[PDB]
Amino acid sequence: SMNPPPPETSNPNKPKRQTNQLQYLLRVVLKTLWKHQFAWPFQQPVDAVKLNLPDYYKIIKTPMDMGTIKKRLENNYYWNAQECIQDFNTMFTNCYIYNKPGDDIVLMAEALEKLFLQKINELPTEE
Numbered sequence: 001s002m003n004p005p006p007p008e009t010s011n012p013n014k015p016k017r018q019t020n021q022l023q024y025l026l027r028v029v030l031k032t033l034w035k036h037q038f039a040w041p042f043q044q045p046v047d048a049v050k051l052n053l054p055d056y057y058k059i060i061k062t063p064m065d066m067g068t069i070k071k072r073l074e075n076n077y078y079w080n081a082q083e084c085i086q087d088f089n090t091m092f093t094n095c096y097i098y099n100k101p102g103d104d105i106v107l108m109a110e111a112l113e114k115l116f117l118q119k120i121n122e123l124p125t126e127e
């Protein structure tokens with residue numbers, strides 16, 4: 001069994017820009033979720049080899065994690081906030097898809113998503 005290469009965090013062909021929404025997503029949203037007590041499983045890609053989940057990357061074909069998102073925000077990978085918000089939502093949805101409702105990992109993802117939705121609710125207007 002083998003893990004895939006992690007998601008792209010640098011691509012000079014992909015257009016990108018700094019925006020006030022993207023800065024908020026880094027300084028407020030990512031920062032806040034990262035320090036959550038249940039953040040740790042989501043701070044890097046799922047290691048399906050170490051966790052003995054040989055079917056994980058057969059079920060989850062768009063993996064995402066906050067380590068990747070952090071790198072993307074820090075390296076200004078995105079064109080807009082929606083691209084980043086989609087990465088977060090993919091991360092949560094991956095977890096809800098692969099696991100049964102009420103599992104520990106799902107509860108942890110649901111906690112982060114609650115804080116996520118709190119923070120996106122107060123997403124600033126474009127400057």
Ligand SMILES: O=c1cc(N2CCOCC2)oc2c(-c3ccccc3)cccc12
Pocket residue numbers: 041042046047051053094095098099105
């Ligand atoms: O969807 C997932 C399913 C799992 N699993 C399956 C159930 O047993 C535990 C491992 O683990 C995940 C982890 C993770 C959990 C513990 C340690 C390291 C990573 C991080 C993010 C998503 C998942």
